Amino acid sequence: TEDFIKKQIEEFNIGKRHLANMMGEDPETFTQEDIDRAIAYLFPSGLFEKRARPVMKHPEQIFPRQRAIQWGEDGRPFHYLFYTGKQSYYSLMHDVYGMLLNLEKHQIGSR
Amino acid sequence: AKHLKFIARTVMVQEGNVESAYRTLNRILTMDGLIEDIKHRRYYEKPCRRRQRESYERCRRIYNMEMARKINFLMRKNRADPWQGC
């Protein structure tokens, strides 16, 4: 939940300052690359799978994107396409279709 | 036997394409039912088997004609999806 992620971010900031102190580097200019190097030094793991190795990352990178509750206190959902069960996908499709209608009315670099 | 010869089931070859002449003659015999009649008359088809085959062929023709009618009726609706996306 949001409060949980906020607490995790506070924990991460405090721990980042602690790790900077441990390694003697400046807490202010301590980057994620520095954190990864420090953790790799302090907790050496030879596990082949990089994901199985110790990680001290931002909670944003760690935790998966959790979809927020889709209705308010009154119970009414927020998006008018909520009951489709795929509100975001169908909203995107609806917007694309509207753009196509407007276009029809008026008139090796990427993948 | 008692009729004149070379009038019935006779086709004239055009420019010497006997293959085309034979194809035309075969189409004529098939459409008139002579080929199927000869194939069926090779052995005696007992009356009950004949009746069953005739009924089966009639049902098959009814079904095929109705399915063809449905296909031709719906063929127009093979157009490009007009409301693509929505």
Q: In 10 A of CB A16, how many CB atoms?
A: 19
CA distance A91 to A80: 9
Using what technique was this structure determined? Answer: cryo-EM
Q: What is the largest CA-CA distance in chain B?
A: 75
Q: Which amino acid is present at B40?
A: H
Both structure tokens of B36 = 């199927």
Check if A100 contacts B (Cβ < 8 Å).
yes
Q: Say if CB B12 and CB B21 are below 8 A apart.
A: yes
CA terminus-to-terminus distance, chain B: 73
Which two structure tokens, joined as six digits, stand for A2?
A: 């949001």
Q: In three state form, how does the secondary structure of A97-109 look?
A: HHHHHHHHHHCCC
Cα–Cα nearest to A30, from A44, A39, A19, A43: A19
Compute the distance between CA of residue A39 and CA of residue A34 in angstroms, rounded to an integer.
9
Query: Residues for chain B: how many in total?
Result: 86
Q: Which amino acid is at B81?
A: D
Judged by phi (left if over 0) then psi (alpha if -120 to 50, else beta), residue A67 lies in beta
Q: What is the DSSP string of B3-16?
A: SPSSSTT--PPSTT
Q: With the C-alpha atoms ordered B46, B51, B54, B56, is the resulting torsion angle positive or negative? A: negative
> Does B86 contact A at CB distance below 8 Å?
yes
Selected for mutation to probe chain B from A81, A89, A97, A103 (highest B CB count within 10 Å) is: A97
CA–CA–CA angle A85, A89, A93 (5° rounding):
125
What is the Cβ-side half-sphere exposure of residue A64, based on CA atoms within 13 angstroms?
2
Asked if B48 is an interface residue toward chain A (Cβ–Cβ < 8 A), one would say no
C-alpha B49/C-alpha B55 separation (Å) is 10
**Cα–Cα distance measured from residue B28 to residue B19, given in angstroms and rounded to the nearest whole number:** 14
A90 to chain B: closest CA residue = B86
For chain A, what is the radius of gyration of the CA atoms? 23
Q: Does B85 touch chain A (CB under 8 A)?
A: yes
CA distance A42 to chain B (A): 54
- State the resolution, in angstroms: 3.0
Distance CA B64, CA B54 (A): 15
